[PDB]
Design a binder for this molecule. Structure first.
Ligand code: HEM
Ligand SMILES: CCCCCC/C=C\CCCCCCCC(=O)O
Ligand SMILES: *[C@@H]1O[C@H](CO)[C@@H](O)[C@H](O)[C@H]1NC(C)=O
Ligand SMILES: *[C@@H]1O[C@H](CO)[C@@H](O)[C@H](O)[C@H]1NC(C)=O
Ligand SMILES: *[C@@H]1O[C@H](CO)[C@@H](O)[C@H](O)[C@H]1NC(C)=O
Ligand SMILES: *[C@@H]1O[C@H](CO)[C@@H](O)[C@H](O)[C@H]1NC(C)=O
Ligand SMILES: *[C@@H]1O[C@H](CO)[C@@H](O)[C@H](O)[C@H]1NC(C)=O
Ligand SMILES: [Cl-]
Ligand SMILES: [Mg+2]
Length: 325
C-alpha cells in the first residue's frame, strides 16, 4: 500500500487507552531491538505477534508516539528493504520468522530487525553488540549504566545531556571490547538519532520537557509498556536535539579492524556533512548487495519500496535507481 500521510490531528492525547491495553507476550510473539516498535506491538498499535506491514508500522509510530511522517517513512522503508519480505510486504520487528512468508534467494536474509549490520548495529544503549551474543534483548547491566548516566548528568532523568555522554561511553566501550565494532554509514546516523527518541517520545506529552524519569524508561525499554495514563507527544517529532548529542563528543565514522582498540576512520563512509551519500550508499551498496540480480516480481517490489524510501529523504538529495526506472 502507499505510505500513510501525516496525522490529521497531532494533539497530545491518552494513547494508553481502553482500545490499546498492554498485554504480556504469548508463545511465538516477536519483540526486537527497538523499544518503540516493541511498545506499539505490546499495546496492539501493531499486530501483537510483532509482524507488520510498512503501512501498519508508519500508522503505529504516528498514532502511538507522534513520530513525524518523514522520519517514519525513511526508517520503516529502510528497515523493510533490508530486513523485510518485499513480496509479502511483511517485516518482523525482531527475529527471523517463517511468518514473513516464502524467502527470496540468497544473499537476501529477510532476518527481521534482529539482523546485525543491515539496520541494527553496535553501541546500542540497552542492547549488547551482536559480537557478545545478543543484539535484541533488554540488558539490565546496560540499563543500570543508563540510570547511572541519568543520575550523573540529568539529575536522575534521561535528557539530551545524558544522551551525549552515554552515546560516547557506548562507542568507547565497543572500541575497548568488540574487535568487530562497526560505526559507519547508516548505523553512524541512526545511533545518534536513537539516543534522542527517549527524551522526545517517551516523555508524557503534557510535560514534553525532554526529561525522562527512570520508572518510565524501564517500562518502555524492558517491558515494552506505556506508563499508566501515558499521553503521546503534543506534536510530530523524531530526532530534534541530535545536534546536542553530536556536539558533546564529535566522532568520525570508522570500525575496529579485527582487534580491540584499533578504531580506524573510514573516509568512504558518509558522515553528518554528507547526508545524501548515506542514502546513496544504503541503496547502491546495502540494498543492491542483498538483491544483486532480482527476478521480475522482486525488481518491481524493490523499485516500489525504493520510491517510498525516497519520500522520507530530506529535500535536496537526488534519487538513485539501482534497477533502472
Ligand atoms: C519508525 C520505524 C522504526 C523503526 C523501523 C525502528 C527500528 C529500530 C531498530 C532496528 C533499532 C535497533 C538499532 C540498534 O540500537 O542497534 C532501533 C532502536 C531504537 N528505537 Fe526504533 N525504530 C523505529 C521507530 C522508533 C520510535 C517511534 C521510537 C520511540 C518512540 C524508537 C525508539 C528507539 C530507541 C530508543 C532505540 C535504541 C535502543 C537502544 O539503543 O537501547 N524507534 N529502532
Ligand atoms: C536527521 C537526523 C540525524 C540522525 C537521526 C537518524 C536518522 C533519521 C531520522 C529521520 C530523518 C529522515 C530523513 C533523513 C534524510 C536523509 O536520509 O538524507
Ligand atoms: C484533536 O484531538 C484533540 C485531543 O486529542 C481533541 O480535543 C480535538 O477535538 C481534536 N480535533 C478534531 C479535529 O477532532
Ligand atoms: C562483524 O562485522 C561485519 C561487517 O564489518 C558484519 O558482517 C558481521 O555480521 C559482524 N558480526 C558481528 C557478530 O559483529
Ligand atoms: C549485558 O551486558 C553486560 C555488559 O556489556 C554483559 O557483560 C552481559 O553478558 C550482557 N548480558 C546479560 C544477559 O546480562
Ligand atoms: C539534563 O538535566 C540536568 C539536571 O537537571 C541539566 O543540568 C541539563 O541542563 C539537562 N539537559 C537538558 C538538555 O535538558
Ligand atoms: C549510485 O548509483 C548511481 C547510478 O545508479 C550513481 O549515479 C551514484 O553516483 C551512485 N552513488 C554512490 C555509489 O554513492
Ligand atoms: Cl508528521
Ligand atoms: Mg544494536
Amino acid at each position: 500500500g502507499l505510505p500513510p500521510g501525516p496525522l490529521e490531528n497531532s494533539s497530545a492525547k491518552l494513547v494508553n487507552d481502553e482500545a490499546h491495553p498492554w498485554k504480556p507476550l504469548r508463545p511465538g510473539d516477536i519483540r526486537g531491538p527497538c523499544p518503540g516498535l516493541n511498545t506499539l506491538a505490546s499495546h496492539g498499535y501493531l499486530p501483537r505477534n510483532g509482524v507488520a506491514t510498512p503501512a501498519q508500522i508508519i500508522n503505529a509510530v504516528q498514532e502511538g508516539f507522534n513520530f513525524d511522517n518523514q522520519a517514519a517513512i525513511f526508517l520503516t522503508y529502510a528497515a523493510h528493504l533490508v530486513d523485510g519480505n518485499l513480496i509479502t510486504d511483511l517485516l518482523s520487528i525482531g527475529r527471523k520468522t517463517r511468518l514473513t512468508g516464502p524467502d527470496p534467494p540468497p544473499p537476501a536474509s529477510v532476518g527481521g530487525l534482529n539482523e546485525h549490520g543491515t539496520f541494527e548495529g553496535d553501541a546500542s544503549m540497552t542492547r549488547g553488540d551482536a559480537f557478545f551474543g545478543n543484539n535484541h534483548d533488554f540488558n539490565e547491566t546496560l540499563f543500570e549504566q543508563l540510570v547511572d548516566y541519568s543520575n550523573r548528568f540529568g539529575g536522575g532523568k534521561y535528557n539530551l545531556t545524558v544522551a551525549g555522554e552515554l552515546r560516547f561511553k557506548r562507542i568507547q566501550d565497543s572500541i575497548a571490547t568488540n574487535p568487530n565494532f562497526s560505526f559507519v554509514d547508516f548505523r553512524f546516523f541512526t545511533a545518534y538519532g536513537e539516543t534522542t527518541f527517549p527524551a522526545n517520545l517517551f516523555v508524557d506529552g503534557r510535560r514534553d520537557d525532554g526529561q525522562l524519569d527512570m520508572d518510565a524508561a524501564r517500562s518502555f525499554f524492558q517491558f515494552s509498556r506505556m506508563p499508566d495514563d501515558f499521553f503521546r507527544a503534543p506534536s510530530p517529532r523524531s530526532g530534534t536535539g541530535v545536534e546536542v548529542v553530536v556536539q558533546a563528543h564529535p566522532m568520525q565514522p570508522g570500525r575496529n579492524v579485527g582487534k580491540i582498540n584499533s578504531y580506524t576512520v573510514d573516509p568512504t563512509s558518509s558522515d553528518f556533512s554528507t547526508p545524501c551519500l548515506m542514502y546513496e550508499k544504503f541503496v547502491n551498496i546495502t540494498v543492491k548487495s542483498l538483491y544483486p540480480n532480482p527476478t521480475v516480481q522482486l525488481r518491481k517490489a524493490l523499485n516500489t519500496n525504493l520510491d517510498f524510501l525516497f519520500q522520507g529523504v530530506a529535500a535536496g538529495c537526488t534519487q538513485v535507481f539501482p534497477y533502472g526506472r
